[PDB]
Design a binder for this molecule. Structure first.
Ligand SMILES: COC(=O)c1c(-c2cccnc2)nc2ncnn2c1-c1cc(F)cc(F)c1
Ligand SMILES: *[C@@H]1O[C@H](CO)[C@@H](O)[C@H](O)[C@H]1NC(C)=O
Lengths: 265, 99
């Protein structure tokens, strides 16, 4: 954080109507980019459509991902066999504490991390024979290692700084959650208390339960996105029936000036 | 490897009877990426349902958001029906309005 990360996926037997290869691009927790092999164009997402960009910004994104499309689809040929295969890549960068770029280049096969790009040697490496086979295929493709080096060491940090400058407001966005605390009957003698946080950003948020002002744990929680890129969270706690009104929930979130106490409805 | 999906169902804003809203079915943690998701209204499949891109987490498992515009009422029940290779039958998860 704040990272610029590309999430790349290829599948060797895509379902009809779905892409063999697709990419989502992320600025921290926000999706800024979409790309798939059926359309062949990198596109901005959401608020980033209105970002003021340098000339040829999205043309350069498209060029880079078309190259990665070919490389990913070529990787299946190096494995042979029927499969099916999923190849994933996590490529990108983040600014370190001394304001320089820190690269990320990891890959997984059928959900298992198995390969990385070594930026010192400029080579793909991994212990599995599948890693060696794909590495060798990529390593002997015309200047693919050099383009990967440039993508990670130059293009990514340049793009990240551009977005940090031109989209600073989008990334500093703070929307406080709407809160609800409700109880429902459960097993005999027991109720489930649920504290829910609606439509907030950034995603970092804490929910805590109190029983008579005293800490009663965090409960069992989960979190997810909404369709606009805001977020949702909830935490639930099993309590004794008839004891529900001794409890409250506390939320901590950057959109709020102080932790907010939430009382039972 | 295969990983079975976690399934969450929640609205975008707190549910208020008669006020337009969005109902979300968030599926996450699954592998491989082929997945089928339907939103149900009192058991009937909802036609006008949209979805995010298929993305994935640091642990490489995929996630995906399905959503539909809706107006909750006192008696209408909603659910999310998910099929995936890890499942012996489609899993149905009812929307808990509290969640
Ligand atoms: C339908 O769009 C989304 O749901 C969405 C978008 C968005 C918003 C507007 C336009 N285009 C993309 N931006 C986001 N930023 C963080 N989450 N998020 C979700 C999201 C994105 C995914 F790739 C997977 C997922 F499960 C949820
Ligand atoms: C980080 O580096 C960029 C590019 O050189 C510069 O514009 C920015 O001011 C730096 N941030 C600091 C020094 O805090």
């Amino acid at each position: 954080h704040l990272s610029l990360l590309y999430h790349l996926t290829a599948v060797s037997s895509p379902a009809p109507g779905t892409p063999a290869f697709w990419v989502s691009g992320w600025l921290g927790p926000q999706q800024y980019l979409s790309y798939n092999s059926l359309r062949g164009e990198a596109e901005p997402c959401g608020a980033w459509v209105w970002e003021n960009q340098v000339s040829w910004y999205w043309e350069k994104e498209t060029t880079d991902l078309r190259i990665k499309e070919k490389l990913f689809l070529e990787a299946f040929k190096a494995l042979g066999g029927k499969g099916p295969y999923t190849l994933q890549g996590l490529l990108g960068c983040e600014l370190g504490p001394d304001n320089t770029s820190v690269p990320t280049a990891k890959f997984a096969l059928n959900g298992e991390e198995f390969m990385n790009f070594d930026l010192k040697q400029g080579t793909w490496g991994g212990d599995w024979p599948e890693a060696l086979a794909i590495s060798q295929r990529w390593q002997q493709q015309d200047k693919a290692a050099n383009k990967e080096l440039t993508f990670l060491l130059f293009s990514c940090p340049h793009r990240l700084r551009e977005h940090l400058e031109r989209g600073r407001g989008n990334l500093e966005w703070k929307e406080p959650p709407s809160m609800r605390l409700k109880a429902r009957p459960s097993s005999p003698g027991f109720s489930v208390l649920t504290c829910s946080a609606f439509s907030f950003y950034p995603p970092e948020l804490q929910l805590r339960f109190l029983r008579n002002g005293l800490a009663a744990g965090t409960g069992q929680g989960d979190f997810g996105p909404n369709s606009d890129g805001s977020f949702h969270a909830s935490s639930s706690l099993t309590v004794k029936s008839g004891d529900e009104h001794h409890y409250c929930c506390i939320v901590q979130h950057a959109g709020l000036a102080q932790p907010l106490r939430v009382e039972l409805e | 490897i295969q990983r079975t999906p976690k399934i969450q169902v929640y609205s975008r804003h707190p549910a208020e009877n008669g006020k337009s809203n969005f109902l979300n079915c968030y599926v996450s943690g699954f592998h491989p990426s082929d997945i089928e998701v339907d939103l149900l209204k009192n058991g009937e499949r909802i036609e006008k349902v949209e979805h995010s891109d298929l993305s994935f987490s640091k642990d490489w498992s995929f996630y995906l958001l399905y959503y539909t515009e809706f107006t909750p009422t006192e008696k209408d029940e909603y659910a999310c029906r998910v099929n995936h290779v890890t499942l012996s039958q489609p899993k149905i998860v009812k929307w808990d309005r509290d969640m």
